[PDB]
Amino acid sequence: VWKDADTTLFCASDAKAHETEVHNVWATHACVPTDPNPQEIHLENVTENFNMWKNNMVEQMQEDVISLWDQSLQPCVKLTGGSVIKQACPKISFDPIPIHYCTPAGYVILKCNDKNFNGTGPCKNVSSVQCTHGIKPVVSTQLLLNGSLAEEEIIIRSENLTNNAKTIIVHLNKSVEINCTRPSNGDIRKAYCEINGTKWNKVLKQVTEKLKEHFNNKTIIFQPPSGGDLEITMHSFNCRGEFFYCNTTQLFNNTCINGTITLPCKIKQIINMWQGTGQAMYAPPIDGKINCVSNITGILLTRDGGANNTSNETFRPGGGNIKDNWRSELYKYKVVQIE
Protein backbone atom coordinates (compact mmCIF):
# COMPACT_ATOMS: atom_id res chain seq x y z
CA VAL A 1 0.00 0.00 0.00
CA TRP A 2 1.38 3.38 -1.07
CA LYS A 3 0.44 6.98 -1.85
CA ASP A 4 1.77 9.85 -3.97
CA ALA A 5 4.46 11.84 -2.16
CA ASP A 6 7.53 14.02 -2.60
CA THR A 7 10.87 13.36 -0.93
CA THR A 8 14.57 14.17 -1.11
CA LEU A 9 16.02 12.13 -3.98
CA PHE A 10 19.66 11.17 -4.42
CA CYS A 11 21.60 10.51 -7.61
CA ALA A 12 23.73 7.68 -8.99
CA SER A 13 26.18 7.59 -11.90
CA ASP A 14 29.15 5.78 -13.45
CA ALA A 15 31.38 8.86 -13.24
CA LYS A 16 35.16 8.45 -13.11
CA ALA A 17 37.03 10.07 -10.22
CA HIS A 18 40.09 10.59 -12.43
CA GLU A 19 38.23 12.53 -15.13
CA THR A 20 38.58 16.30 -15.50
CA GLU A 21 35.31 16.44 -17.44
CA VAL A 22 32.89 18.60 -15.45
CA HIS A 23 29.88 16.27 -15.29
CA ASN A 24 32.20 13.53 -14.03
CA VAL A 25 33.66 15.88 -11.42
CA TRP A 26 30.21 16.93 -10.22
CA ALA A 27 28.79 13.40 -10.09
CA THR A 28 31.89 12.08 -8.31
CA HIS A 29 31.13 14.34 -5.36
CA ALA A 30 27.33 14.56 -5.65
CA CYS A 31 26.33 11.00 -6.60
CA VAL A 32 26.91 7.39 -5.55
CA PRO A 33 27.91 4.52 -7.87
CA THR A 34 25.08 2.82 -9.77
CA ASP A 35 23.56 -0.50 -8.72
CA PRO A 36 25.19 -3.26 -10.81
CA ASN A 37 22.13 -5.49 -10.40
CA PRO A 38 19.01 -3.28 -10.21
CA GLN A 39 15.66 -4.86 -9.35
CA GLU A 40 12.32 -4.15 -11.03
CA ILE A 41 8.97 -5.45 -9.80
CA HIS A 42 6.17 -5.57 -12.36
CA LEU A 43 2.89 -4.89 -10.56
CA GLU A 44 -0.19 -6.96 -11.39
CA ASN A 45 -3.62 -5.44 -12.06
CA VAL A 46 -2.81 -1.94 -10.80
CA THR A 47 -3.97 1.42 -12.12
CA GLU A 48 -1.83 4.45 -11.35
CA ASN A 49 -2.34 8.07 -12.39
CA PHE A 50 0.65 10.05 -13.65
CA ASN A 51 1.18 13.73 -14.41
CA MET A 52 4.47 14.62 -16.10
CA TRP A 53 3.57 18.32 -15.89
CA LYS A 54 3.25 18.22 -12.10
CA ASN A 55 6.21 16.10 -11.05
CA ASN A 56 8.62 17.14 -8.29
CA MET A 57 11.32 14.88 -9.76
CA VAL A 58 11.61 17.47 -12.53
CA GLU A 59 12.18 20.35 -10.10
CA GLN A 60 14.86 18.30 -8.33
CA MET A 61 16.72 17.47 -11.54
CA GLN A 62 16.56 21.14 -12.53
CA GLU A 63 18.21 22.06 -9.22
CA ASP A 64 21.01 19.55 -9.82
CA VAL A 65 21.74 20.78 -13.34
CA ILE A 66 21.76 24.41 -12.20
CA SER A 67 24.19 23.47 -9.43
CA LEU A 68 26.35 21.56 -11.92
CA TRP A 69 26.52 24.46 -14.40
CA ASP A 70 27.15 27.04 -11.66
CA GLN A 71 30.16 25.06 -10.42
CA SER A 72 31.45 24.13 -13.88
CA LEU A 73 30.74 26.81 -16.49
CA GLN A 74 32.12 30.15 -15.35
CA PRO A 75 31.21 33.17 -17.50
CA CYS A 76 33.70 36.06 -17.61
CA VAL A 77 31.00 38.55 -16.64
CA LYS A 78 27.82 37.90 -14.65
CA LEU A 79 25.03 40.47 -14.94
CA THR A 80 22.44 39.41 -12.38
CA GLY A 81 20.20 41.76 -10.41
CA GLY A 82 22.14 44.98 -10.95
CA SER A 83 25.29 43.33 -9.62
CA VAL A 84 28.27 42.86 -11.94
CA ILE A 85 30.57 39.91 -11.25
CA LYS A 86 33.90 39.71 -13.06
CA GLN A 87 35.75 36.42 -12.64
CA ALA A 88 38.09 33.97 -14.36
CA CYS A 89 36.51 32.01 -17.20
CA PRO A 90 38.75 29.03 -18.03
CA LYS A 91 38.08 26.57 -20.85
CA ILE A 92 36.76 23.23 -19.64
CA SER A 93 36.13 19.62 -20.64
CA PHE A 94 32.39 19.31 -21.21
CA ASP A 95 30.35 16.22 -22.14
CA PRO A 96 27.13 15.21 -20.31
CA ILE A 97 26.93 11.80 -18.62
CA PRO A 98 23.83 9.80 -17.61
CA ILE A 99 22.50 10.54 -14.12
CA HIS A 100 20.11 8.22 -12.27
CA TYR A 101 17.55 9.49 -9.75
CA CYS A 102 16.82 7.28 -6.76
CA THR A 103 14.49 7.12 -3.75
CA PRO A 104 15.55 6.75 -0.09
CA ALA A 105 14.14 4.16 2.32
CA GLY A 106 10.37 4.20 2.80
CA TYR A 107 9.82 5.34 -0.77
CA VAL A 108 9.86 3.83 -4.25
CA ILE A 109 9.59 4.98 -7.87
CA LEU A 110 6.65 3.79 -9.95
CA LYS A 111 7.33 3.47 -13.67
CA CYS A 112 4.68 3.53 -16.39
CA ASN A 113 5.34 0.93 -19.08
CA ASP A 114 2.33 1.61 -21.31
CA LYS A 115 3.68 1.78 -24.86
CA ASN A 116 1.54 4.73 -26.01
CA PHE A 117 1.61 6.65 -22.72
CA ASN A 118 1.33 10.41 -23.29
CA GLY A 119 2.55 11.47 -19.85
CA THR A 120 -0.78 12.14 -18.14
CA GLY A 121 -3.61 9.97 -16.86
CA PRO A 122 -3.89 6.30 -15.83
CA CYS A 123 -1.26 3.66 -16.64
CA LYS A 124 -2.12 -0.05 -16.84
CA ASN A 125 1.37 -1.57 -16.98
CA VAL A 126 3.21 -0.26 -13.92
CA SER A 127 6.45 -1.40 -12.30
CA SER A 128 8.35 -0.34 -9.18
CA VAL A 129 12.03 0.61 -9.31
CA GLN A 130 14.60 2.13 -6.95
CA CYS A 131 16.18 4.37 -9.60
CA THR A 132 15.31 5.93 -12.95
CA HIS A 133 17.25 5.09 -16.10
CA GLY A 134 20.39 7.09 -16.89
CA ILE A 135 19.41 10.58 -18.02
CA LYS A 136 21.89 12.93 -19.70
CA PRO A 137 21.31 16.55 -18.59
CA VAL A 138 21.41 17.96 -22.13
CA VAL A 139 20.45 21.64 -22.15
CA SER A 140 18.97 22.72 -25.48
CA THR A 141 16.17 24.56 -27.23
CA GLN A 142 13.87 23.60 -30.13
CA LEU A 143 15.40 20.12 -30.53
CA LEU A 144 15.82 17.52 -27.79
CA LEU A 145 19.20 15.81 -28.14
CA ASN A 146 20.70 12.48 -27.02
CA GLY A 147 17.54 11.41 -25.22
CA SER A 148 15.52 8.20 -25.18
CA LEU A 149 13.17 7.26 -28.03
CA ALA A 150 9.53 6.22 -27.96
CA GLU A 151 9.38 2.45 -28.40
CA GLU A 152 6.31 2.19 -30.66
CA GLU A 153 4.61 5.22 -32.20
CA ILE A 154 5.58 8.89 -32.06
CA ILE A 155 4.10 10.43 -28.91
CA ILE A 156 2.57 13.89 -28.52
CA ARG A 157 2.82 15.38 -25.02
CA SER A 158 1.07 18.47 -23.65
CA GLU A 159 -0.48 19.59 -20.37
CA ASN A 160 -3.40 20.88 -22.45
CA LEU A 161 -3.35 20.63 -26.25
CA THR A 162 -6.35 22.97 -26.51
CA ASN A 163 -4.31 25.65 -24.73
CA ASN A 164 -1.90 27.06 -27.32
CA ALA A 165 0.14 28.64 -24.51
CA LYS A 166 1.19 25.17 -23.34
CA THR A 167 4.36 23.68 -24.82
CA ILE A 168 4.11 20.54 -26.95
CA ILE A 169 6.74 17.81 -26.63
CA VAL A 170 7.10 15.53 -29.64
CA HIS A 171 8.73 12.21 -28.75
CA LEU A 172 10.36 10.57 -31.78
CA ASN A 173 10.47 6.80 -32.27
CA LYS A 174 13.46 7.04 -34.61
CA SER A 175 16.46 9.32 -34.11
CA VAL A 176 17.92 11.64 -36.74
CA GLU A 177 21.58 12.62 -36.45
CA ILE A 178 22.62 16.27 -36.42
CA ASN A 179 26.27 16.99 -37.24
CA CYS A 180 27.54 20.34 -35.95
CA THR A 181 31.01 21.72 -36.67
CA ARG A 182 33.11 24.81 -36.09
CA PRO A 183 35.82 24.05 -38.70
CA SER A 184 39.57 24.42 -38.17
CA ASN A 185 41.93 26.66 -40.19
CA GLY A 186 38.57 33.44 -40.60
CA ASP A 187 35.42 33.77 -38.52
CA ILE A 188 36.08 31.79 -35.34
CA ARG A 189 32.39 31.97 -34.41
CA LYS A 190 31.02 30.73 -37.73
CA ALA A 191 29.69 27.17 -37.68
CA TYR A 192 27.18 24.82 -39.30
CA CYS A 193 25.02 21.74 -38.74
CA GLU A 194 24.49 18.94 -41.27
CA ILE A 195 21.37 16.74 -41.34
CA ASN A 196 20.23 14.03 -43.76
CA GLY A 197 17.32 15.70 -45.55
CA THR A 198 15.78 12.39 -46.59
CA LYS A 199 15.73 11.05 -43.02
CA TRP A 200 14.51 14.29 -41.46
CA ASN A 201 11.69 15.04 -43.91
CA LYS A 202 10.44 11.46 -43.61
CA VAL A 203 10.35 11.77 -39.82
CA LEU A 204 8.73 15.21 -39.97
CA LYS A 205 6.03 13.82 -42.28
CA GLN A 206 5.31 11.16 -39.66
CA VAL A 207 5.11 13.86 -36.99
CA THR A 208 2.50 15.71 -39.06
CA GLU A 209 0.41 12.53 -39.31
CA LYS A 210 0.52 12.10 -35.53
CA LEU A 211 -0.49 15.71 -34.91
CA LYS A 212 -3.46 15.11 -37.22
CA GLU A 213 -4.72 12.40 -34.87
CA HIS A 214 -4.72 14.94 -32.04
CA PHE A 215 -6.12 17.89 -33.98
CA ASN A 216 -9.19 16.43 -35.69
CA ASN A 217 -7.39 15.93 -39.02
CA LYS A 218 -6.76 19.64 -39.53
CA THR A 219 -3.96 20.61 -41.91
CA ILE A 220 -0.60 20.73 -40.12
CA ILE A 221 1.84 23.50 -41.04
CA PHE A 222 5.29 24.38 -39.71
CA GLN A 223 6.67 27.92 -39.51
CA PRO A 224 9.79 29.58 -38.05
CA PRO A 225 9.42 31.24 -34.61
CA SER A 226 7.70 34.64 -34.71
CA GLY A 227 10.23 36.40 -32.49
CA GLY A 228 11.75 36.64 -29.03
CA ASP A 229 15.20 35.86 -27.66
CA LEU A 230 17.81 34.12 -29.82
CA GLU A 231 17.69 31.15 -27.46
CA ILE A 232 14.09 30.61 -28.58
CA THR A 233 14.17 31.56 -32.27
CA MET A 234 17.22 29.35 -32.86
CA HIS A 235 18.29 25.84 -31.93
CA SER A 236 20.67 26.52 -29.05
CA PHE A 237 22.85 23.91 -27.39
CA ASN A 238 26.25 23.43 -25.79
CA CYS A 239 29.04 21.62 -27.62
CA ARG A 240 32.34 21.00 -25.80
CA GLY A 241 31.64 23.98 -23.53
CA GLU A 242 30.81 26.28 -26.43
CA PHE A 243 27.33 27.76 -26.92
CA PHE A 244 25.99 27.05 -30.41
CA TYR A 245 23.03 28.90 -31.95
CA CYS A 246 21.67 27.37 -35.16
CA ASN A 247 19.09 28.62 -37.67
CA THR A 248 16.46 25.92 -38.22
CA THR A 249 14.44 27.57 -41.00
CA GLN A 250 15.43 24.76 -43.38
CA LEU A 251 14.37 21.99 -40.98
CA PHE A 252 10.73 23.00 -40.76
CA ASN A 253 9.97 23.18 -44.47
CA ASN A 254 6.37 22.38 -45.43
CA THR A 255 7.35 22.06 -49.10
CA CYS A 256 9.53 19.03 -48.33
CA ILE A 257 6.70 17.46 -46.32
CA ASN A 258 16.36 15.25 -50.14
CA GLY A 259 20.11 15.88 -49.92
CA THR A 260 22.19 17.19 -47.03
CA ILE A 261 20.64 20.12 -45.17
CA THR A 262 23.21 22.63 -43.92
CA LEU A 263 22.04 24.89 -41.09
CA PRO A 264 24.01 28.11 -40.50
CA CYS A 265 25.22 28.37 -36.89
CA LYS A 266 27.06 30.85 -34.68
CA ILE A 267 29.02 30.40 -31.46
CA LYS A 268 27.86 33.02 -28.95
CA GLN A 269 29.66 34.28 -25.86
CA ILE A 270 26.94 36.65 -24.69
CA ILE A 271 23.82 34.68 -23.85
CA ASN A 272 20.69 34.78 -21.72
CA MET A 273 21.29 32.27 -18.93
CA TRP A 274 18.81 29.39 -18.97
CA GLN A 275 19.03 29.35 -15.17
CA GLY A 276 16.91 32.52 -15.34
CA THR A 277 19.63 34.69 -13.83
CA GLY A 278 19.89 37.49 -16.39
CA GLN A 279 22.69 37.69 -18.94
CA ALA A 280 26.30 36.49 -19.07
CA MET A 281 29.41 36.67 -21.24
CA TYR A 282 31.34 33.43 -21.60
CA ALA A 283 34.87 32.97 -22.96
CA PRO A 284 35.71 32.91 -26.72
CA PRO A 285 35.92 29.46 -28.41
CA ILE A 286 38.91 27.09 -28.35
CA ASP A 287 41.11 26.52 -31.39
CA GLY A 288 40.83 23.64 -33.84
CA LYS A 289 37.82 21.68 -35.03
CA ILE A 290 34.87 21.84 -32.64
CA ASN A 291 32.45 19.01 -33.43
CA CYS A 292 29.36 17.43 -31.89
CA VAL A 293 27.23 14.68 -33.41
CA SER A 294 23.91 14.29 -31.61
CA ASN A 295 20.73 12.26 -31.98
CA ILE A 296 17.56 14.29 -32.38
CA THR A 297 15.07 12.37 -30.24
CA GLY A 298 12.43 15.03 -29.60
CA ILE A 299 10.97 18.35 -30.72
CA LEU A 300 9.56 21.24 -28.69
CA LEU A 301 6.67 23.01 -30.42
CA THR A 302 4.40 25.99 -29.82
CA ARG A 303 1.04 26.14 -31.61
CA ASP A 304 -0.29 29.35 -33.17
CA GLY A 305 -3.40 30.89 -31.65
CA GLY A 306 -6.36 32.31 -33.55
CA ALA A 307 -6.81 29.43 -36.00
CA ASN A 308 -10.17 28.15 -34.73
CA ASN A 309 -12.09 29.36 -37.79
CA THR A 310 -9.65 27.82 -40.29
CA SER A 311 -8.72 24.26 -41.24
CA ASN A 312 -5.04 24.85 -40.46
CA GLU A 313 -2.96 24.48 -37.31
CA THR A 314 0.48 26.11 -37.30
CA PHE A 315 3.41 24.87 -35.22
CA ARG A 316 6.72 26.62 -34.55
CA PRO A 317 9.87 25.29 -32.85
CA GLY A 318 10.31 26.74 -29.38
CA GLY A 319 10.42 25.94 -25.68
CA GLY A 320 13.25 27.40 -23.62
CA ASN A 321 11.92 26.26 -20.27
CA ILE A 322 14.65 23.70 -19.64
CA LYS A 323 12.42 21.85 -17.17
CA ASP A 324 10.58 20.53 -20.23
CA ASN A 325 13.80 18.81 -21.29
CA TRP A 326 13.77 16.86 -18.03
CA ARG A 327 10.04 16.14 -18.41
CA SER A 328 10.78 14.49 -21.76
CA GLU A 329 12.70 11.81 -19.87
CA LEU A 330 11.01 11.79 -16.45
CA TYR A 331 7.42 11.55 -17.75
CA LYS A 332 7.02 7.85 -16.91
CA TYR A 333 8.15 8.12 -13.28
CA LYS A 334 6.54 9.21 -10.03
CA VAL A 335 7.52 8.92 -6.37
CA VAL A 336 5.28 7.16 -3.85
CA GLN A 337 5.60 6.62 -0.10
CA ILE A 338 5.22 3.11 1.31
CA GLU A 339 2.87 3.13 4.30
Site for ligand 0LL (CB under 6 A): which residue of 106, 276, 288, 305? Answer: 276
Tell me how far, at minimum, the Cβ of 39 lies from ligand NAG, in Å: 18
**Residues numbered 121-160 forming contacts with ligand 0LL, rule: CB under 6 A:** 139-141
Tell me how far, at minimum, the Cβ of 74 lies from ligand NAG, in Å: 19
Site for ligand 0LL (CB under 6 A): which residue of 64, 231, 313, 329? Answer: 231
Site for ligand NAG (CB under 6 A): which residue of 91, 210, 266, 323? Answer: 210
Tell me how far, at minimum, the Cβ of 321 lies from ligand 0LL, in Å: 4
Tell me how far, at minimum, the Cβ of 27 lies from ligand 0LL, in Å: 20
- 3-state secondary structure labels for all residues of the chain: CEEECCCCCEEEECCCCCCCCHHHHHHHHHEEECCCCCCEEECCCCCEEEECCCCHHHHHHHHHHHHHHHHHCCCCEEEECCEEEECCCCCCCCCCCCEEEECCCCEEEEEECCCCCCCEEEECCEEEECECCCECCCCECCEEECCCCCCCCCEEECCCCCCCCCCEEEEEEEEEEEEEEECCCCCCCEEEEEEEHHHHHHHHHHHHHHHHHHCCCCEEEECCCCCCCHHHHCEEEEECCEEEEECCCCCCCCCCCCCEEEEEEEECCEEECCCCCCEEECCCCCCCCEEEEEEEEEEEEEECCCCCCCCEEEEEECCCCCHHHHHHHHCCEEEEEEC
Site for ligand 0LL (CB under 6 A): which residue of 261, 271, 335, 336? Answer: 271
Tell me how far, at minimum, the Cβ of 140 lies from ligand NAG, in Å: 7
Site for ligand NAG (CB under 6 A): which residue of 76, 79, 221, 256? Answer: 256
Site for ligand NAG (CB under 6 A): which residue of 217, 223, 310, 312? Answer: 217
Residue 248 engages ligand 0LL in binding (rule: CB under 6 A): no
